[PDB]
């Protein structure tokens, strides 16, 4: 079963093995027990070259795991700026909502990724999107006392 | 002649003790090395000063005193001071680690490491006495050693010296010069466990002494040196009857008979007058009537309280200096109708009078001017319950949330001891109310 080998290769950053497995019929949209695909793992562990190769071979840019997370959610949470830009260029839903009501904007705001917050806003991230507790990205910036984030969100 | 042993516990007791023994030496004419040229009997004697001083054989006059502290800093100043040759070196006892402002450390854990040595050293002084009458114990309410160690010591002295009297000179806390936030706790805990073992206790309110230094002595920011010099003057006036010839408060038993009508309400108020700055060296000398009137003014009291709010059970006036008995009696007559003095119905309305015709001594370097006549009034009034209420209120504010209680529990103490100590203070406030306040 090459689907499990492609998931391991995408996580470990084995660029050459990703090429070999796809050439031998491996399922690019293979999922692990929690619904994560090779694109989710590549976006989480910061393998930009694997993200681009998977997107040129039919990866669903808006795939969701059992908790509603898209690859854009995970790249915005971990802080991989170049991956966030490649994903948005390939049609990622900037306003995708996971099982906690969080959007990628919420996660980049919580983790202090200010450059990713700016990129998301320039691609139409909804400043009024509330999480399950009713909080928008701006509410997070006021509650935590993050003046730099509050200034970026007031643009 | 019946001997008295003084015990000084913790920083406050040691520092006040050092100031008191310096003043006692100047009043009896004892040099810092222990020599007394006026003492004709070398090697011993039955004179009044021998109640506080023993004699060795080479004419040395040694205080009947023991200094104890759980850390050495403060006692080391007495070991290197001016009167370093005066005390017995084995009667200056120090541990290595203090009670960290915690009653439980002073009473249960740290204090237990040195209690047997302290009692064995006290025993050596006791064995040297022909007629020991009791002990004078100096200590703070707020410190961990002053509160916890003193309570442990007082419990042991009651077992080993059953029929002997025990008097206290206690420092009540003031926020202006306090050292710890838990001092109300330490004050209530030591009062509860010492109440049964003490016959009479003279509380000294640091706020009252601080205010006197500011108002009368013009000292902007009084330090412990200024406070202790004034406290030693008052302590000397109280103990003068035990160290000199006289007919009032001549032994420790008489302090109880004259000032303590019931065992638990054993906290008399001391008032002292006149307190004049040393820069006013050419001040007009105040008459007997003027200084006696000053004893009924709350500003001259050792404890902040209002005696107009209470009733008197006892009142002793102890004069020092140029005081004619008929002038005292005339002043007592005027301070019966002109002022509002109410005694309890079950006690005689009389005032006990004692006169020592030598004026008070001033210490070189002190803040007080020399005076031709001075007076110390000792009275048991129900108004002193105001001091207990202020302390109980501070205890209640913190204890309702159990703030800082874990520090006491972590040092071998049960939480129940806090409620039983507070219950005893509730009963004590009620005891004053039952008499009348």
């Amino acid at each position: 079963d090459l689907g499990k080998k492609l998931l391991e290769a995408a996580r470990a950053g084995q660029d050459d093995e990703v090429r070999i497995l796809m050439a031998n019929g491996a399922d690019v949209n293979a999922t692990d027990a929690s619904g994560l695909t090779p694109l989710h793992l590549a976006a989480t562990y910061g393998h930009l070259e694997i993200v681009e190769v998977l997107l040129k071979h039919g990866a669903d840019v808006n795939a969701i795991d059992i908790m509603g997370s898209t690859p854009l959610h995970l790249a915005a949470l971990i802080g991989h700026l170049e991956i966030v830009e490649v994903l948005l260029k390939h049609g990622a839903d900037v306003n995708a909502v996971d099982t906690w009501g969080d959007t990628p904007l919420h996660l980049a705001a919580i983790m202090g990724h200010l450059e990713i917050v700016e990129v998301l806003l320039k691609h139409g991230a909804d400043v009024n999107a509330q999480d399950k507790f009713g909080k928008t990205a701006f509410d997070i910036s006021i509650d935590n006392g993050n003046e730099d984030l509050a200034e970026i969100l007031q643009k | 002649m019946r001997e008295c042993i003084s015990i000084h516990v913790g920083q406050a007791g040691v520092q006040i003790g050092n100031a008191c023994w310096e003043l006692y030496c100047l009043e009896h004419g004892i040099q810092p090395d222990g020599q007394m040229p006026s003492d004709k009997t070398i090697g011993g004697g039955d004179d009044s000063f021998n109640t506080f001083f023993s004699e060795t054989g080479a004419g040395k006059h040694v205080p009947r005193a023991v200094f104890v502290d759980l850390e050495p800093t403060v006692i080391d100043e007495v070991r290197t001071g001016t009167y370093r040759q005066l005390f017995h070196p084995e009667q200056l006892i120090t541990g290595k680690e203090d009670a960290a402002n915690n009653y439980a450390r002073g009473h249960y854990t740290i204090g237990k490491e040195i209690i047997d040595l302290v009692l064995d050293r006290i025993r050596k002084l006791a064995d040297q006495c022909t007629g020991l009458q009791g002990f004078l114990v100096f200590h703070s309410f707020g410190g961990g050693t002053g509160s916890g160690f003193t309570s442990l010591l007082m419990e042991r002295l009651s077992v080993d010296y059953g029929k002997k009297s025990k008097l206290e000179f206690s420092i009540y806390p003031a926020p202006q010069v306090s050292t710890a936030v838990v001092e109300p706790y330490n004050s209530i805990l030591t009062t509860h466990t010492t109440l049964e073992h003490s016959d009479c206790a003279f509380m000294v309110d640091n706020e009252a002494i601080y205010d006197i230094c500011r108002r009368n002595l013009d000292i902007e920011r009084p330090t412990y040196t200024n406070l202790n010099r004034l406290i030693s003057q008052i302590v000397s006036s109280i103990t003068a009857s035990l160290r000199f010839d006289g007919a009032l408060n001549v032994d420790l038993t008489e302090f109880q008979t004259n000032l303590v009508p019931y065992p638990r309400i054993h906290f008399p108020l001391a008032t002292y007058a006149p307190v004049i700055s040393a820069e006013k060296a050419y001040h007009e000398q105040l008459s007997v009537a003027e200084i006696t009137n000053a004893c009924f003014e709350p500003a001259n009291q050792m404890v902040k309280c209002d005696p107009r709010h209470g009733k008197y059970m006892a009142c002793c006036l102890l004069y020092r200096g140029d005081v004619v008995p008929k002038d005292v009696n005339a002043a007592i007559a005027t301070i019966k109708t002109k002022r509002s003095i109410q005694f309890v119905d079950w006690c005689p309305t009389g005032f006990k009078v004692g006169i020592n015709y030598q004026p008070p001594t001033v210490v070189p370097g002190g803040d007080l001017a020399k005076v031709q006549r001075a007076v110390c009034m000792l009275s048991n009034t129900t108004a002193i319950a105001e001091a207990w209420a202020r302390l109980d209120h501070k205890f209640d504010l913190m204890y309702a949330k159990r703030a800082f209680v874990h520090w006491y529990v972590g040092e071998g103490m049960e939480e129940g001891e806090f409620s039983e100590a507070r219950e005893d203070m509730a009963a004590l406030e009620k005891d004053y109310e039952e008499v009348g306040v």
Partner: protein
Amino acid sequence: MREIVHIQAGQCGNQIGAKFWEVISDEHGIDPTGSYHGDSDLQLERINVYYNEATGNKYVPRAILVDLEPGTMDSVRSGPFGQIFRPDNFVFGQSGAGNNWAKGHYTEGAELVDSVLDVVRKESESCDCLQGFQLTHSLGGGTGSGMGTLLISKIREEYPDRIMNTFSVMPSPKVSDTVVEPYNATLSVHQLVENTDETYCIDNEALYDICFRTLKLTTPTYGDLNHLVSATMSGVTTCLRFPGQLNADLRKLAVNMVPFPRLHFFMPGFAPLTSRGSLTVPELTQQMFDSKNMMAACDPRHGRYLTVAAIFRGRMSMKEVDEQMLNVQNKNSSYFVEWIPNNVKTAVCDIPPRGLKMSATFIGNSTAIQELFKRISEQFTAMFRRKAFLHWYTGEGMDEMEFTEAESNMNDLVSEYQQYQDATAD
């Protein structure tokens, strides 16, 4: 009592630890060689608290240096005051922690903990009457956080009656862009709540904000952030190192500042704020109670002070300090809990630090510190909900329940601060 044994663990621990010794040695008149060059006998009266007397009348710090990477050992030795440390007290490992708390607490760190405990015992037996321990470390890394907390628990086991004090650096995405730092800090806080008596919370978020907004530094460096850390550590340890009025010790500080056992995390502060090259008494009192002078990124006006200790340093009027402290207490009366009377203590020291003629150091136990813990808790939950990089910890033997237990304990600590923030005395 007197002696303190100091321990500095991990990258951050050793960097801020070395700066502490450089700053206090200059104040006490000790050169890198160890010889005394000061012109005042007040610099030597309480030297025994931090230094041991060596042969030839020379003073060697009672400091233990530890890390799982040898590179840190070389960086400390090559410093100005690097040769004064005892070479026997340098306990370094071969493989580092790699910003992983589990490597420091259970695998790499657990194998080197016995060797550090041997030099701790050696320093402790040479003490006349040891009062406690002070540890410098970060909570976002692997060695200072993971091995530092393991070393605290083992020292607590052999010395259960001695005080444990820490200078803990809290992480911020503004200084270090490593997303596993909320995991390492949350796991460390779970340990600190149980095993330390008093912790100074030095927050990198607050240090960066001070440098960038107040000192106008566009790109603050670690040296700039550590300039404020060294000034804070000098200020909070002043009374332990000089005579003054207070008979200074860590146990009396704990008994008076910690009303509840778990609420032992202090918010330090300093005034004036200055840079690595570039005041009246009422001006110092005002800055001490301002949110911009706090070393923890929390607004004191958002909570209530349970206890406060202030240390004024320099030549100044004693009555003026008493008067100005009283004025700030009345104007800000609603920010102090009314159920702990006389909860603000003032200390004075004549010897000021070098460069400044007068300074003030603030130590507050305030409920507003919950904002610092909520910031770390939110980042921990954002990462933990997606189980990101969890295998890096479970792979070293850690159980998944340890993350949930640390998370639950931190939320209970925030709940405990809110309980006493809303309490009333009547």
